[PDB]
Design an enzyme around this catalytic site. Structure first.
Site, PDB file in Angstrom:
ATOM      1  N   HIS A 126      16.302  11.573  -3.885  1.00 35.80           N
ATOM      2  CA  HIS A 126      16.385  11.414  -2.443  1.00 35.80           C
ATOM      3  C   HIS A 126      15.184  10.558  -2.029  1.00 35.80           C
ATOM      4  CE1 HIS A 126      17.185  12.825   1.725  1.00 35.80           C
ATOM      5  NE2 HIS A 126      15.871  12.833   1.850  1.00 35.80           N
ATOM      6  N   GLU A 127      13.988  11.080  -2.281  1.00 32.49           N
ATOM      7  CA  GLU A 127      12.745  10.405  -1.920  1.00 32.49           C
ATOM      8  C   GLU A 127      12.635   8.942  -2.317  1.00 32.49           C
ATOM      9  OE1 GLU A 127      10.541  11.805   0.196  1.00 32.49           O
ATOM     10  OE2 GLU A 127      11.976  13.448   0.234  1.00 32.49           O
ATOM     11  N   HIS A 176      14.324   6.677   0.069  1.00 28.63           N
ATOM     12  CA  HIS A 176      13.454   6.281   1.149  1.00 28.63           C
ATOM     13  C   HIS A 176      12.607   5.118   0.639  1.00 28.63           C
ATOM     14  CE1 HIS A 176      14.602   9.421   3.812  1.00 28.63           C
ATOM     15  NE2 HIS A 176      14.151  10.401   3.049  1.00 28.63           N
ATOM     16  N   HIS A 223       5.416  11.520  -2.059  1.00 24.68           N
ATOM     17  CA  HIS A 223       4.556  12.684  -2.223  1.00 24.68           C
ATOM     18  C   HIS A 223       5.375  13.958  -2.275  1.00 24.68           C
ATOM     19  CE1 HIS A 223       1.185  10.221  -0.074  1.00 24.68           C
ATOM     20  NE2 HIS A 223       1.424   9.798  -1.303  1.00 24.68           N
ATOM     21  N   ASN A 270       0.815  -1.208   0.000  1.00 22.80           N
ATOM     22  CA  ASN A 270       0.000   0.000   0.000  1.00 22.80           C
ATOM     23  C   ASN A 270       0.854   1.265   0.000  1.00 22.80           C
ATOM     24  OD1 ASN A 270      -2.515  -1.664   0.304  1.00 22.80           O
ATOM     25  ND2 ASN A 270      -1.681  -2.047   2.379  1.00 22.80           N
ATOM     26  N   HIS A 306      17.982   8.754   6.717  1.00 20.02           N
ATOM     27  CA  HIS A 306      18.910   9.844   6.471  1.00 20.02           C
ATOM     28  C   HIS A 306      20.351   9.508   6.828  1.00 20.02           C
ATOM     29  CE1 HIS A 306      15.539  13.113   6.478  1.00 20.02           C
ATOM     30  NE2 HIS A 306      15.682  12.532   5.301  1.00 20.02           N
ATOM     31  N   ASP A 322       5.438   4.627  -1.690  1.00 18.60           N
ATOM     32  CA  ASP A 322       4.885   5.858  -2.233  1.00 18.60           C
ATOM     33  C   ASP A 322       5.640   7.134  -1.856  1.00 18.60           C
ATOM     34  OD1 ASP A 322       3.226   3.826  -2.829  1.00 18.60           O
ATOM     35  OD2 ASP A 322       1.376   4.816  -2.137  1.00 18.60           O
TER      36      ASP A 322
HETATM   37  C1  LIG Z   1      20.984  16.598  -3.307  1.00 17.44           C
HETATM   38  C2  LIG Z   1      19.621  16.532  -2.783  1.00 17.44           C
HETATM   39  C3  LIG Z   1      18.493  16.485  -2.373  1.00 17.44           C
HETATM   40  C4  LIG Z   1      17.114  16.432  -1.883  1.00 17.44           C
HETATM   41  N1  LIG Z   1      17.071  16.420  -0.434  1.00 17.44           N
HETATM   42  C5  LIG Z   1      15.934  16.706   0.336  1.00 17.44           C
HETATM   43  C6  LIG Z   1      16.119  17.349   1.602  1.00 17.44           C
HETATM   44  C7  LIG Z   1      15.001  17.693   2.456  1.00 17.44           C
HETATM   45  C8  LIG Z   1      13.690  17.372   2.029  1.00 17.44           C
HETATM   46  S1  LIG Z   1      12.284  17.805   3.053  1.00 17.44           S
HETATM   47  O1  LIG Z   1      12.219  19.267   3.124  1.00 17.44           O
HETATM   48  O2  LIG Z   1      11.150  17.104   2.450  1.00 17.44           O
HETATM   49  C9  LIG Z   1      12.597  17.181   4.718  1.00 17.44           C
HETATM   50  C10 LIG Z   1      12.030  15.801   5.112  1.00 17.44           C
HETATM   51  C11 LIG Z   1      12.712  14.702   4.246  1.00 17.44           C
HETATM   52  O3  LIG Z   1      13.931  14.485   4.334  1.00 17.44           O
HETATM   53  N2  LIG Z   1      11.898  14.071   3.325  1.00 17.44           N
HETATM   54  O4  LIG Z   1      12.460  13.072   2.533  1.00 17.44           O
HETATM   55  C12 LIG Z   1      10.440  15.772   4.933  1.00 17.44           C
HETATM   56  C13 LIG Z   1       9.777  14.536   5.550  1.00 17.44           C
HETATM   57  N3  LIG Z   1      10.106  14.446   6.954  1.00 17.44           N
HETATM   58  C14 LIG Z   1       9.137  14.364   7.994  1.00 17.44           C
HETATM   59  O5  LIG Z   1       7.896  14.284   7.801  1.00 17.44           O
HETATM   60  O6  LIG Z   1       9.773  14.414   9.247  1.00 17.44           O
HETATM   61  C15 LIG Z   1       9.268  14.521  10.647  1.00 17.44           C
HETATM   62  C16 LIG Z   1       7.732  14.687  10.681  1.00 17.44           C
HETATM   63  C17 LIG Z   1       9.700  13.334  11.500  1.00 17.44           C
HETATM   64  C18 LIG Z   1       9.858  15.818  11.176  1.00 17.44           C
HETATM   65  C19 LIG Z   1      11.574  14.366   7.277  1.00 17.44           C
HETATM   66  C20 LIG Z   1      12.351  15.568   6.646  1.00 17.44           C
HETATM   67  C21 LIG Z   1      13.478  16.716   0.787  1.00 17.44           C
HETATM   68  C22 LIG Z   1      14.590  16.388  -0.038  1.00 17.44           C
HETATM   69 CA   LIG Z   2       3.128   1.265  -2.409  1.00 21.24          CA
HETATM   70 ZN   LIG Z   3       1.779  12.432   1.809  1.00 19.56          ZN
HETATM   71 ZN   LIG Z   4      14.497  12.588   3.415  1.00 19.95          ZN
END
Ligand SMILES: CC#CCNc1ccc(S(=O)(=O)CC2(C(=O)NO)CCN(C(=O)OC(C)(C)C)CC2)cc1
Ligand SMILES: [Ca+2]
Ligand SMILES: [Zn+2]
Ligand SMILES: [Zn+2]
Ligand SMILES: [Ca+2]
Ligand SMILES: [Ca+2]
Length: 162
Positions: free
Chosen positions: A119-120, A123, A97, A91, A129, A95
């Protein structure tokens, strides 16, 4: 590099992804290329492969949304959170977003889709990280032929191999 403790990896080598919807700021082609290039990163150093489906369910459902969008992990408007993906699993697992409140590009202005997406998907594959400020999986965005840093290479291969 760091990995989550869970659910570690996908039991299959060839995964599927789907682009549910698109962002205003880039043409369908631009976006498709970014995501395609984002996966190419991880597929080049691993036995993994990604197939794009036009509809139906895919292992990695990609979508652009703003604020609350169906998982109770709302976006905060421009800047701040850029995008989030869930580790391997059924599920929602896998994914990704992307905050449609940010400005997505193919350049340096706003946020570079490809880089964030790269990056995403990390994950989406099991990587958490990295503490290495040079790793693609470092929590801070930084704009940069794209060569995947060593730490990141170590990361996925420790899960899926070369
Ligand atoms: C080279 C290169 C690159 C891309 N790096 C990058 C850095 C930060 C983010 S972000 O601003 O989305 C930070 C985040 C991230 O790293 N997303 O992937 C979001 C999701 N997240 C979250 O919901 O965390 C809590 C609620 C536990 C605080 C952890 C931090 C996305 C991409
Ligand atoms: Ca899925
Ligand atoms: Zn979402
Ligand atoms: Zn991240
Ligand atoms: Ca178009
Ligand atoms: Ca945001």
């Amino acid at each position: 590099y760091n990995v989550f403790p869970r659910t570690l990896k996908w039991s299959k080598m060839n995964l599927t992804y789907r682009i549910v919807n698109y962002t205003p700021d880039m043409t369908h082609s631009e976006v498709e290329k970014a995501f395609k290039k984002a996966f190419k990163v991880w597929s080049d150093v691993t036995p993994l492969n990604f197939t794009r489906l036009h509809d139906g369910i895919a292992d990695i459902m990609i979508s652009f949304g703003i604020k609350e969008h169906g998982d109770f992990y709302p976006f905060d408007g421009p800047s701040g959170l850029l995008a989030h993906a869930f580790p391997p699993g059924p599920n929602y697992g896998g994914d990704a977003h992307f905050d449609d409140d940010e400005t997505w590009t193919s350049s340096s202005k706003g946020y570079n889709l490809f880089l964030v997406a790269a990056h995403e998907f990390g994950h989406s594959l099991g990587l958490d990280h990295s503490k290495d400020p040079g790793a693609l999986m470092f929590p801070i965005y930084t704009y940069t032929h794209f060569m995947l840093p060593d730490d990141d290479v170590q990361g996925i291969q420790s899960l899926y191999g070369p």
